[PDB]
């Protein structure tokens, strides 16, 4: 890999500089290089990896949705035929998006998940696995669509089972997991009632545990609780 000659600590330092500069493709390449050194990641380093790739795939998803909308309109009744270019360019952005998701899934499988023994690291990585299968499912249309959806579901379910046994209901990893699994049910699995039930239960169990928290922990947990409430407002 092109980062193989750079020290681990220098890759982490440069990932933080790239974040300040809003250079998220660079940030992701630096963090990929750090993972490939083979050592486990600290909490802060896990968050740098996820922020970098979220920003890269987020720009690809936004572009894909614009292009897919134009393509679908061109397939309506009365729309002028304009040739293969819209489909070709949507396909180009799709293939790039798939490549990024495959890169993240490959880092998780070789070897981040198998070396993660503490609940906080294991749940974080299994959540990420569910998220990147979810982004693959948003663009999937062929023979493997069902299997891609089931891979997202299976990763999120294993993460949920560990989080319920090992973490309090206010823990920010547990809350963000439940938030994103609820989005999976609503947007991917055609299961809006499951989405609303999960978001409601998660919100109520977190509310009842806030009394145990410091001011700083309370701020972290209530920020995510607000996102659950905002989705419930959109979905009901």
């Amino acid at each position: 890999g092109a980062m193989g000659s750079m020290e681990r600590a220098s890759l982490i330092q440069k990932a933080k500089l790239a974040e300040q500069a809003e250079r998220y493709e660079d940030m992701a390449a630096f963090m990929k290089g750090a993972v490939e050194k083979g050592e486990e990641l600290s909490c802060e380093e896990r968050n740098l990896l996820s922020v970098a790739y979220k920003n890269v795939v987020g720009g690809q998803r936004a572009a894909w949705r614009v292009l897919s909308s134009i393509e679908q309109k061109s397939n309506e009744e009365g729309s002028e035929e304009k040739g293969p270019e819209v489909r070709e360019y949507r396909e180009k952005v799709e293939t790039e998006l798939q490549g990024v998701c495959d890169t993240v899934l490959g880092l998780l499988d070789s070897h981040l998940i198998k070396e993660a023994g503490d609940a906080e690291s294991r749940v974080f990585y299994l959540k990420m696995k569910g998220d990147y299968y979810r982004y693959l499912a948003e663009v999937a249309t062929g023979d493997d669509k069902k299997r891609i959806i089931d891979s997202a579901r299976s990763a999120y379910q294993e993460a949920m089972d560990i989080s319920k046994k090992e973490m309090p209901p206010t823990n920010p990893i547990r809350l963000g997991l439940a938030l994103n699994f609820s989005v999976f049910h609503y947007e991917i699995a055609n299961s809006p009632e499951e989405a609303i039930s999960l978001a409601k239960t998660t919100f109520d169990e977190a509310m009842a545990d806030l009394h145990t928290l410091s001011e700083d922990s309370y701020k972290d947990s209530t920020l995510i609780m607000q996102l659950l409430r905002d989705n419930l407002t959109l979905w009901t």
Binding site: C43, S50, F124, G176, N180, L227
Partner: peptide, 10 residues
């Protein structure tokens, strides 16, 4: 339009 989260406060 739905909200999701990639990070987890340390």
């Amino acid at each position: 339009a739905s909200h999701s989260m990639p990070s987890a406060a340390c």
